[PDB]
Amino acid sequence: VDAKQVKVLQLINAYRFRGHEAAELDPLGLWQRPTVAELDPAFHNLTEDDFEETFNVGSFAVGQETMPLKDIYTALKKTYCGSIGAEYMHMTDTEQKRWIQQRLESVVGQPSFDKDEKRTFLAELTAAEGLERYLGAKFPGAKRFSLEGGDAMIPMMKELIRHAGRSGMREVVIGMAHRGRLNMLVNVLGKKPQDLFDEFAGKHWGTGDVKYHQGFSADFATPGGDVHLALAFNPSHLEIVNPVVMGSVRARQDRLGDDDGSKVLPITIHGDSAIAGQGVVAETFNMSQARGFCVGGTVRVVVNNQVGFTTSNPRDTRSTMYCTDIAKMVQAPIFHVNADDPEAVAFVTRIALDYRNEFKRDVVIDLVCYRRHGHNEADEPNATQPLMYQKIKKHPTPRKLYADVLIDRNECDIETATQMVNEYRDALDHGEVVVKEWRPMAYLGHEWDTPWSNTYDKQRLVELGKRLCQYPESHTLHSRVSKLYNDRTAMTNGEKELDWGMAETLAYATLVDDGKRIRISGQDSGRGTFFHRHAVLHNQNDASTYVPLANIHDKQGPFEVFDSVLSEEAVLAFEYGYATAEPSGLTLWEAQFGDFANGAQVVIDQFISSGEQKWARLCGLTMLLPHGYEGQGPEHSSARLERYLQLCAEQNMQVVVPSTPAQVYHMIRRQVVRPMRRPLIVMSPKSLLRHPLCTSSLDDLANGTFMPAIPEIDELDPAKVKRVVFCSGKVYFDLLEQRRNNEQDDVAIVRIEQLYPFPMDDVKAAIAPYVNVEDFVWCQEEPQNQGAWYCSQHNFRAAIPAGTELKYAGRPASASPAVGYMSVHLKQQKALIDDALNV
């Protein structure tokens, strides 16, 4: 009934919502943060006399039901306006808001750490500073992307790993960028400092990568036992590694049966400028609770040194007060903490991990710090941030402030802190591992033409097909789906040749029949964009689903196909991380059309095509890219085959253009059964899914094999052949039908199904019979500046007899991939067919 008691409650609520806006977060003290009137008691009409009266605390979780207002006011400022700026009241979940209030408000901001723990934090701050000054002394001017100014991340990361083992987690996977990367390698993951000193000195499998992109694996002793540690390889492109780490841990969580993600912990580290500006951050946040990509939530740490290279003005880097405001899209709590207060850092770190393990949701730690040097060690920061570095020049390091605090508290002494600095310098001189909790951990690279088991028992293959066509009798299907499954029933009885959708389905069935995993993701991949797959049967009565590939037999390998979020960059990065972590199974990503894969171009350029040469990473990821010129316009015709062929080199990737249902069946099986794990780029057909001539028999599947090149199929006279037409994909069936309708027999048509690595022997074998050949033609639907022409012509010339010429037949070069009009498309298609067939 008291009115001021209600005013006290609104004062508490105002600090929970907005206390972070006045918190002393900047270590440099340069921030002049705008005043918030609600934090002032006078805003709530509380006077000096009210401060002496006792009040009930309401839901304020300080640990006593009643206390005087002067003590309530002191409690709020210490809880929410000290070194910790807690941002959590935007969340809608009441239980989670109560959970955070119990952690912070009972502590009243002041964490209690053991003298052993306080010494470990100081020793870890000593390791962070000492390694960085050591590298600056020994290699002056060399780029190292120093952690200095953000030294608290080293105790934070080791406290995160220790708390992860303390909570029974088995593995931790980390994605990070350049900032503090060498510090994380030496002082957390346990890389030998002498090995790091060798890399600065010029001592080095493949073409390699820069020192601050390297990953690492190690075991790490924790109170709860040894934990495996993994630090990802990444390119210079920022933030893209985050989805890749999400895929790796999900592949780990799948293998371990960790359905709630409590055994494998994902940690991503971000820069303040990068996390605000890169769109892949939002795409990954949008996948955090998708059933096909969720990993139980990620702990996300921003090393917020308040500058991006030469850009520090908030009006240039972002549109909001905090770089972490993107996290609000998924209502993640955000803990801003001053980096000069390591105990607040470790205290916020335990809370953020406990929140992640409790509610299985993303959580963000904003480590507000500074950059002691320029963006790199050879760059001048004063030219563009004069005031910031005039303050940094007179700012003591976090180790020195923390040691001074412990000494004034008589929780440490000056000689112990001095011993840490000098002893760590000697340990770097010794060159051995300086991580006391480090522990030792307790191929698939064969050439593409390695022999593999292509055959399958034909009766088992029919038995698998009969099981694929079965579904519960109460699970009513839509009539168009019942029709397609009836066609699939006729294919299993030999009454019809198999179409693309059936041969693709049997390929998955044989792999789960062998216990191999299959994970498919992509937009509308459950049904298929072109209505050909229908891996998921939707009941017409309720909305229940049934997946025949998940019901082959007990003890089968797992099968999953996910309708992916409407994203390409983060999703393709996720599946690359999944396939690299678990190469044994099939991992396939399907673009809706191949034209849209260029939105994930960074994953294609910096991971898929180059990860083996740069990091010795094998990845067997399969990419289905629908492709084909059928008159549907520039964005529904070309998967940009020319770009993938341009990326091919040093056996890095496979580029394949299957033309038969049997070819895609063996192609898929070869990607698992053959002991090689390199990316498989596939030009998926569209009209060929229903082309009457694009069919295969059960004998082609059971006893056939993937053909890198397909010889002439029609009854020709080898001596009468005047021209051989090379081609790939659906253009073959256009050439084949026109050549038959012309009753032509002086023209041979040979398909090159695998465009890279180039199958020279198979191509020469297909061309041997025509001893009277005069010229060779490469026919393609693509414009002359696209497709295989400019990139693969040298391979075609090396295969043909020396006396013959190679000629081009195809669409003219064009700036746009395809014409906007169907009528123009059909006339262009007929011209390239007639030109290829015209002796």
Ligand X SMILES: Cc1ncc(C[n+]2csc(CCOP(=O)(O)OP(=O)(O)O)c2C)c(N)n1
**Site mask, Mg ion, residues 111-140, x = CB under 5 A?**
------------------------------
Write out the binding residues for Ca ion, residues 262-281 only, by CB under 5 A. 279
178 is in an annotated binding site: yes
Is 273 a binder of ligand X (CB under 6 A)? Answer: yes
Q: Give the interface segment with Mg ion, choosing from 29-37, 77-85, 159-167, 300-308 (CB under 5 A).
A: 300-308
Angular region, 499: left φ>0, alpha ψ -120 to 50, beta rest = beta
In the complex with Mg ion, which residue's Cβ is closer, 177 or 731?
177
Residue 274 interacting partner from its own copies, Ca ion, Mg ion, none (CB closer than 5 to 8 Å by kind): its own copies
Candidate list 136, 215, 599, 769; residue touching ligand X; CB under 6 A = 599
238 is in an annotated binding site: yes
Q: How far is the CB of 650 from its own copies (least distance, A)?
A: 5
Q: Give the interface segment with Mg ion, choosing from 44-52, 236-244, 307-315, 399-407 (CB under 5 A).
A: 307-315
In the chain, DSSP finds a helix count (H) and a strand count (E) of 29, 25
In the complex with its own copies, which residue's Cβ is closer, 615 or 665?
615
DSSP for 703-721 reads H----SEE---S---GGG-
| Nearest-angstrom CA–CA distance, 294 and 285 | 10
CA 192 to chain centre: 28
**Site mask, ligand X, residues 284-313, x = CB under 6 A?**
-------------------x-x-xxx----
In the complex with Ca ion, which residue's Cβ is closer, 61 or 602?
602
Identify whether the C-beta of residue 330 lies closer than 8 Å to the C-beta of residue 362.
yes
Is 305 a binder of Mg ion (CB under 5 A)? Answer: yes
In the complex with its own copies, which residue's Cβ is closer, 480 or 740?
480
Of 508, 465, 786, 537, which Cα lies nearest the Cα of 622?
508
Residue with tokens 């015209």: 838
Beta-sheet strands, E only, within 383-517 = 438-439
Residue nearest to ligand X (CB): 271
In this structure, the strands spanning 66-68 and 84-87 are: unpaired
824 is in an annotated binding site: no
In the complex with its own copies, which residue's Cβ is closer, 95 or 426?
95
In the complex with Ca ion, which residue's Cβ is closer, 486 or 598?
598
Is 568 a binder of Ca ion (CB under 5 A)? Answer: no
| Count of residues engaged in binding Mg ion, rule: CB under 5 A | 4
Write out the binding residues for Mg ion, residues 773-812 only, by CB under 5 A. none
Identify whether the C-beta of residue 61 lies closer than 8 Å to the C-beta of residue 105.
yes
Q: How far is the CB of 258 from its own copies (least distance, A)?
A: 19
Residue with tokens 């005087």: 68
Rounding to the nearest 10 degrees, give the CA dihedral for residues 615, 621, 622, 625: -60
Q: Give the interface segment with Ca ion, choosing from 306-314, 520-528, 549-557, 568-576 (CB under 5 A).
A: 568-576
- What's the N-to-C CA distance of the chain in angstroms? 101
Of 496, 489, 502, 786, which Cα lies nearest the Cα of 646?
786
Per DSSP, 693 falls in state T
Is 592 a binder of ligand X (CB under 6 A)? Answer: yes
Write out the binding residues for ligand X, residues 366-405 only, by CB under 6 A. 375
In the complex with its own copies, which residue's Cβ is closer, 204 or 436?
204
Per the DSSP assignment, residues forming a β-bridge with 438 are 220
Q: How far is the CB of 372 from ligand X (least distance, A)?
A: 12
In the complex with its own copies, which residue's Cβ is closer, 58 or 111?
58
3 state DSSP class of 457: coil
Kindly state the helix (H) or strand (E) to which residue 218 belongs, with its residue range. Answer: strand 216-222
Identify whether the C-beta of residue 122 lies closer than 8 Å to the C-beta of residue 131.
no
In the complex with its own copies, which residue's Cβ is closer, 121 or 578?
578
200 is in an annotated binding site: no
741: burial class by Cβ within 10 Å (0-12, 13-18, 19+)?
A: exposed
In the complex with Ca ion, which residue's Cβ is closer, 208 or 279?
279
Identify whether the C-beta of residue 799 lies closer than 8 Å to the C-beta of residue 767.
yes
Is 612 a binder of Ca ion (CB under 5 A)? Answer: no
3 state DSSP class of 501: helix
Output phi, psi for 809, to 5 deg.
Answer: -135, 120
Write out the binding residues for Ca ion, residues 327-386 only, by CB under 5 A. none
Output phi, psi for 689, to 5 deg.
Answer: -60, -25
Of 286, 369, 354, which Cα lies nearest the Cα of 323?
369
Structure-block tokens of residue 819: 């014409």
| Nearest-angstrom CA–CA distance, 271 and 224 | 31
Rounding to the nearest 10 degrees, give the CA dihedral for residues 791, 794, 795, 799: 160
Q: How far is the CB of 150 from ligand X (least distance, A)?
A: 8
The residues near 24 (Cβ < 8 Å, ≥ 6 apart) are: 81, 82, 83, 338
44 is in an annotated binding site: no
Q: Give the interface segment with ligand X, choosing from 23-31, 266-274, 438-446, 573-581 (CB under 6 A).
A: 266-274
Is 167 a binder of ligand X (CB under 6 A)? Answer: no
Strand order in the sheet with 622-626: 559-563, 518-522, 586-590, 622-626, 680-684, 654-656, 754-756
Candidate list 271, 577, 585, 787; residue touching ligand X; CB under 6 A = 271
Q: How far is the CB of 165 from ligand X (least distance, A)?
A: 28
Q: How far is the CB of 318 from Ca ion (least distance, A)?
A: 17
The CA-based angle 18-23-25, given to 5 degrees, is: 130
**Site mask, ligand X, residues 222-261, x = CB under 6 A?**
--------------xxx-----------------------
Residue 780 interacting partner from its own copies, Ca ion, ligand X, none (CB closer than 5 to 8 Å by kind): none
State whether the Cα torsion 92-95-100-105 is positive or negative: positive
Q: Give the interface segment with Mg ion, choosing from 213-221, 306-314, 648-656, 756-764 (CB under 5 A).
A: 306-314
Residue 255 interacting partner from Ca ion, ligand X, its own copies, none (CB closer than 5 to 8 Å by kind): none
486 is in an annotated binding site: no
Write out the binding residues for ligand X, residues 523-542 only, by CB under 6 A. 523
Whether a cis peptide bond, with omega within 30° of 0, leads into 757 is yes
CA distances in angstroms from 270 to 13, 240, 379, 476, 706, listed in the order given = 31, 11, 21, 49, 44
248 is in an annotated binding site: no
Is 179 a binder of ligand X (CB under 6 A)? Answer: yes
| Count of residues engaged in binding Ca ion, rule: CB under 5 A | 2
752: burial class by Cβ within 10 Å (0-12, 13-18, 19+)?
A: buried
Is 569 a binder of Ca ion (CB under 5 A)? Answer: yes
Task: Find the helix packing angle between 69-80 and 3-18, rounded to 10°.
Answer: 10
Identify whether the C-beta of residue 639 lies closer than 8 Å to the C-beta of residue 593.
yes
Whether a cis peptide bond, with omega within 30° of 0, leads into 314 is no
Residue 158 interacting partner from Mg ion, its own copies, ligand X, none (CB closer than 5 to 8 Å by kind): none
Candidate list 239, 272, 568, 782; residue touching Mg ion; CB under 5 A = 272
Residue 309 interacting partner from ligand X, Mg ion, Ca ion, none (CB closer than 5 to 8 Å by kind): ligand X
305 is in an annotated binding site: yes
Is 312 a binder of Mg ion (CB under 5 A)? Answer: no
| Nearest-angstrom CA–CA distance, 30 and 554 | 65
Q: How far is the CB of 326 from Mg ion (least distance, A)?
A: 15
In the complex with ligand X, which residue's Cβ is closer, 580 or 592?
592
Residues near Mg ion (CB under 5 A) are 271-272, 305, 308
Residues near ligand X (CB under 6 A) are 179, 236-238, 271-274, 303, 305, 307-309, 375, 523, 566, 568, 592, 596, 599
Annotated binding-site members for Ca(2+):
569
Annotated binding-site members for Mg(2+):
272, 305, 307
Annotated binding-site members:
178-179, 236, 238, 272-274, 305, 307, 375, 569, 596
Annotated binding-site members for thiamine diphosphate:
178-179, 236, 238, 273-274, 305, 375, 596
Residues near Ca ion (CB under 5 A) are 279, 569
